[PDB]
Ligand binder design. Sequence first.
Ligand SMILES: C[C@H](O)CCC[C@H](O)CCC/C=C/c1cc(O)cc(O)c1C(=O)O
Ligand SMILES: C[C@H](O)CCC[C@H](O)CCC/C=C/c1cc(O)cc(O)c1C(=O)O
Ligand SMILES: [K+]
Ligand SMILES: [K+]
Lengths: 268, 269
Amino acid sequence: MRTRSTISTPNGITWYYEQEGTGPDIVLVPDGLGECQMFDSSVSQIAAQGFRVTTFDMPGMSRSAKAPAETYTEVTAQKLASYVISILDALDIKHATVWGCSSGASTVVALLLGYPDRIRNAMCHELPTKLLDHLSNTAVLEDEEISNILANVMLNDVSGGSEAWQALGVEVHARLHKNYPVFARGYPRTIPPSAPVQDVEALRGKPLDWTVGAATPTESFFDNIVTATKAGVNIGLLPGMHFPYVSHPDVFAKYVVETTQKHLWNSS
Amino acid sequence: MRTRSTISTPNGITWYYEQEGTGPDIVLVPDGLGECQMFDSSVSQIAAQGFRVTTFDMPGMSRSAKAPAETYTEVTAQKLASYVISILDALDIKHATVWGCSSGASTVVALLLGYPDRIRNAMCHELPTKLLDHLSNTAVLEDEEISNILANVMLNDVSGGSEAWQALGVEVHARLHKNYPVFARGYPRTIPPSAPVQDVEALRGKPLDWTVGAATPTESFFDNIVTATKAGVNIGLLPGMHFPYVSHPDVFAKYVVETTQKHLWNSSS
Ligand SMILES: C[C@H](O)CCC[C@H](O)CCC/C=C/c1cc(O)cc(O)c1C(=O)O
Ligand SMILES: C[C@H](O)CCC[C@H](O)CCC/C=C/c1cc(O)cc(O)c1C(=O)O
Ligand SMILES: [K+]
Ligand SMILES: [K+]
């Protein structure tokens, strides 16, 4: 019942995508590691509630690696939003609910603000607005050292569940190992400054639902809570840290379903 | 240069307190464990910047244990604020900057709202507004089990620094051992519903500086960040978790001094 296929867009990207279900469109945008297998359990649970769910690997990452260098270098929320619109155009998805974490969160807020006719509502999780020198400095290391360091960071610092993270399995971790250097050299210097949350008044009244991880250290996304509250945007918590769709897939799925249902009611 | 003494207030409490320094008054209200030795390093560093610093063990706790049962049972922010005003009256402290964490945070916001002529400015850290059934349920246990459970929670989960926590020393931990059952039976069921943050408009424009621990799990005091932001109150982070004066005493002292200095400049304007 799950489609697993590839599709080429006129910007040069060959996307790997997955799709399951019928009904209103929900699109799950990966975090910066660009790996859509992290959504696998949740895709079936969401689709089973009457939705068409689409996800994809991000350009330059995992099975979407056949892409021009511009799509995975000097990456911004606005570039990623343009790329997501390209694949939604290719798949004839005219109106969608979107979810994203991390650079995915920056991407879905850019999607909602830039393409309002295309976006029913956006769920953003842990949107990075601050430069981290420790992360930006990994870009000058050798690929194998980047992969070793960032594999450790993801498991021990931000996975929000070491057993679930490791249970993604050897095939997923082998793809992430190859993504870490692409992510390190493309994302951490350019993503945070591109955060589309500098204009608080532009967020006010928008169909945005913002979350942070319950277990995440307060300092990590303190600024998200402040910004959301200043904008009057719905702000709450999911269990775990940076990857709730990995750590707590059933809670994640229920959240996506209930949030989409609330906006479908509000739209009529 | 530290005064270490006792003072009896007509509400029945015999307080243990400490004082150091001369200058504008800064008062350090303990968290619910009620133990003012946790401020020892910071009291000297703050006083050295030209302040008179006062702290005290809280009623029923540590060396302030000679107190009526009303002062350490069914404890509310409003009761604690009335008790702090009683010791400030007894020490002739008319106008003070105040710090408090946890129930001490609830106390200092209650002091600022309820006694505004007495409070130059308040610094509140990790103010509890939510009931926690797992903590409330400890009240029905025997004293020794309460002490073992909460000693473990403070050391390993919320100290923000296990080595600094242990370095409080054997005498402090012997006092905290006796305080854990008093705290368990008198605080967790009644402090959160008494939180003086139901009226966001009452906080607006008040000389309040609110912090949360940088390492604290987001869920613990997420509501503090939301409430402070809604009220336009200065909200920020200190290193560590629930006990910044234990985990990061020099950062804590600097924050108390700089915040007090900011309000002294503003008061003159
Ligand atoms: C050795 C170093 O200190 C590493 C320690 C710091 C941790 O890496 C923080 C981990 C999560 C970073 C998210 C993030 C940040 C960003 O600026 C752009 C992004 O796209 C993302 C994302 O995961 O997508
Ligand atoms: C056995 C369980 O799992 C215990 C686990 C939970 C952590 O103990 C508490 C985290 C911080 C809250 C303290 C607190 C709460 C309150 O309702 C009144 C107070 O006065 C305080 C205070 O420290 O003053
Ligand atoms: K789950
Ligand atoms: K320090």
